[PDB]
Amino acid sequence: MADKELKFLVVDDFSTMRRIVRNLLKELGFNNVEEAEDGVDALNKLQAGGYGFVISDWDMPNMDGLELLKTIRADGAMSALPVLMVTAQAKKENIIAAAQAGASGYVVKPFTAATLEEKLNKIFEKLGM
Ligand SMILES: [Mn+2]
């Protein structure tokens, strides 16, 4: 996956968390990044088209990460979009529920750029990107 212009959507209700993820992506060379504050905001942006990767917080108001993921996976236009779930605390039950709903990966925050890079590269490889 050599497309450094792959378009990311970073979804989290905390603006500071979004800025952290955006800055880590920038460090890796991924600058084509937009933000959303909950699952509905995210879906509105995704329908505008052009996105290549979603990084979503697990716990958000109104529409949480699991519901966002399910909605993406059920939509024929975006059903193959990579989705990386982010959580403050790994839980077996959540990991399995996310996998059942089609998550591409799952990672615990706070994470470093190196950890993010590894997550992304393993997802790109798993998905044949
Ligand atoms: Mn949150």
Swiss-Prot record:
Query: 4-aspartylphosphate modification sites?
Result: D57
What's the superkingdom here?
Bacteria
Q: Primary place of residence?
A: cytoplasm
| The protein's required cofactors | Mg(2+)
Name the residues that bind Mg(2+).
Answer: D12, D13, D57, D59
Start and end residues of each Response regulatory domain:
7-124
Q: Name one GO molecular function term.
A: magnesium ion binding
Positions carrying N6-acetyllysine are K92, K109
Biological process terms from the Gene Ontology for this record are: aerotaxis; bacterial-type flagellum-dependent swimming motility; chemotaxis; internal peptidyl-lysine acetylation; phosphorelay signal transduction system; regulation of bacterial-type flagellum-dependent cell motility; regulation of chemotaxis; signal transduction
Q: Which UniProt keywords apply?
A: Acetylation, Chemotaxis, Cytoplasm, Flagellar rotation, Magnesium, Metal-binding, Phosphoprotein, Two-component regulatory system
User: What result is annotated for mutating I95 to D/K/M?
Assistant: Loss of CW flagellar rotational signaling activity
Q: Where does the protein end up?
A: Cytoplasm
- Is the NADP keyword given for this protein? no
Q: Does the keyword Magnesium apply?
A: yes
Report the cofactor remark: Binds 1 Mg(2+) ion per subunit.
Question: Which GO cellular component terms, listed alphabetically, does the Swiss-Prot or TrEMBL entry include?
Answer: bacterial-type flagellum; bacterial-type flagellum basal body, C ring; bacterial-type flagellum rotor complex; cytoplasm; cytosol
What role does this protein play?
Involved in the transmission of sensory signals from the chemoreceptors to the flagellar motors. In its active (phosphorylated or acetylated) form, CheY exhibits enhanced binding to a switch component, FliM, at the flagellar motor which induces a change from counterclockwise to clockwise flagellar rotation. Overexpression of CheY in association with MotA and MotB improves motility of a ycgR disruption, suggesting there is an interaction (direct or indirect) between the c-di-GMP-binding flagellar brake protein and the flagellar stator.
Quaternary context: Interacts (phosphorylated CheY) with CheZ (via C-terminus).
* PANTHER family in the cross-refs: TWO-COMPONENT RESPONSE REGULATOR (PTHR43228), TWO-COMPONENT RESPONSE REGULATOR ARR22 (PTHR43228:SF1)
The molecule here is called Chemotaxis protein CheY
Q: Which gene encodes it?
A: cheY
